[PDB]
């Protein structure tokens, strides 16, 4: 079912095995990076424990990182069973195409790319590993990442973890704790959800 679908929940406690297998996974986790907290983070062990491995047999994982999560994110990526094969960096500009941890000012954000199994029929090499785009809102990711992913694997099932309302996209299932309820349209998914959650509560 091509149109947007989402699930409000806690990704820690949701049983993601009901969701099926996806050609692409994306996650922009709330890493417990440096001190303080504008939102609710997850501990390193909670990130290690996330049941990412069930979501894919063959395909690609996209994993935003920052600070020490560049190392941590590589550990989860490896533990969950992926090989890191690319790394996308987003160069943050303004509307006039000029450039906008403590040793160096940070002009970019990194997104690790991992592979699991042997994906086949993907248009590898279409885009390049750099993204240039205006910073729309703080803590948001650039919409271009969706276009790059669609061109790489057109028409396939994709799932985003730790999304927010603006992230909902056709061909995607968005999981996040700030979404409005449970909006699901794919029959096979609706079935397994009702089976696992007959009273509708994770």
């Amino acid at each position: 079912l091509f149109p947007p679908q989402w699930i409000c929940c806690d990704i820690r406690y949701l049983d993601v095995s009901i969701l099926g297998k996806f050609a692409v996974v994306m996650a922009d986790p709330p890493w417990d990076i440096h001190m303080e907290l504008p939102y609710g983070t997850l501990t390193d062990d909670e990130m290690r424990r996330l049941n990412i491995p069930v979501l894919q047999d063959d395909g690609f994982l996209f994993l935003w990182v920052t600070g020490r999560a560049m190392e941590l994110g590589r550990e989860c990526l490896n533990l969950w069973g992926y090989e890191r094969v690319d790394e996308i960096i987003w160069v943050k500009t303004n509307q006039l195409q000029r450039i906008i941890g403590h040793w160096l000012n940070h002009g970019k954000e990194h997104c690790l790319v991992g592979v699991k199994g042997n994906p086949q029929g993907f248009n590898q090499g279409l885009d390049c590993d750099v993204i240039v785009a205006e910073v729309r809102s703080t803590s948001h990711k650039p919409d271009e990442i969706y276009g790059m992913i669609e061109r790489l694997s057109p028409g396939t099932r994709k799932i985003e973890l730790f999304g927010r309302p603006h992230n909902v996209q056709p061909n995607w299932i968005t999981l996040g704790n700030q979404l409005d309820g449970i909006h699901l349209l794919d029959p096979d998914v609706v079935a397994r959800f009702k089976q696992r959650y007959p009273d509708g509560i994770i």
Partner: protein, 241 residues
């Protein structure tokens, strides 16, 4: 701009524009810089211990096989065995060129092997304004258009991007901008560039490399530049009179 690159062959970085005066800092680095010293050495075969005293900054630019994907390469196997910890000051800095493939993981293993924490990921983005494609690594998912230079610290102004146009096929030079970033950090004056070439030799820097055609290195002459009262200068202050 990612759709545009899919359309026209112009990498998104082609369209970045603009790519007070810290000119006083540039002059204080210049006055403080030691004479350029250089030594040709087969670093494979060379005891990295004869390189004394211990170094405040190390710039490490080993020749990766991927730099010749069009034209002695070093594997990450060979690099990881260099005894970098033996010649680093107890508080010191490394900048390691990692390319864009396995190096971004293996280079982090090296930094941890020699005792550093990664503090900065400096990214060299290459525009292709003068030739709007690339033959990809088998594992590659996207076209690779950047290289990473990892910065590590051990012990207790600028941006993390360098934008130049992609060099001519089989030109392996890294942007000279890397040296400005390092110098502007004022990390100390004992600076070593391993696998430099004749073309990278530079004031305030000791260059060691297999392809150097001349050497002038003398450990006692080198040590004299840092004997008291100059042992602790940042490289950014006035000379002691």
């Amino acid at each position: 701009y990612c759709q545009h690159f899919v359309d026209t062959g112009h990498r998104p970085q082609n369209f970045i524009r603009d790519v007070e005066l810290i000119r006083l800092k540039d002059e204080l680095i210049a006055k403080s810089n030691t004479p350029p010293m250089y030594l040709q050495a087969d670093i494979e075969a060379f005891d990295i211990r004869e390189l004394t005293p211990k170094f405040d900054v190390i710039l490490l630019e080993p020749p990766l096989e991927e730099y010749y994907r069009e034209t002695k390469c070093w594997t990450w196997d060979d690099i990881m065995k260099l005894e970098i910890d033996e010649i680093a000051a107890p508080r010191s800095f490394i900048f390691l060129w990692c390319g864009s493939g396995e190096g971004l993981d293996l280079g982090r293993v090296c930094l941890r092997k020699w005792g550093y924490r990664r503090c900065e990921d400096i990214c060299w983005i290459k525009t292709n304004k003068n030739n709007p494609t690339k033959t990809l690594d088998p594992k590659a998912v996207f076209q690779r258009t950047k290289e990473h230079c990892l910065m590590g610290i051990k012990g207790t102004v600028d941006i993390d991007l360098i934008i130049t146009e992609e060099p001519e096929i089989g030109n392996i030079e890294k942007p000279v901008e890397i040296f400005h970033i390092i110098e502007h950090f004022c990390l100390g004056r004992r600076r070593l560039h391993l696998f430099g070439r004749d073309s990278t030799i530079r004031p305030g820097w000791l260059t060691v490399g297999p392809t150097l055609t001349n050497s002038n290195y003398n450990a006692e002459t080198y040590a004299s530049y840092f004997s008291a009262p100059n042992s602790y200068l940042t490289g950014c202050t006035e000379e002691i009179e």
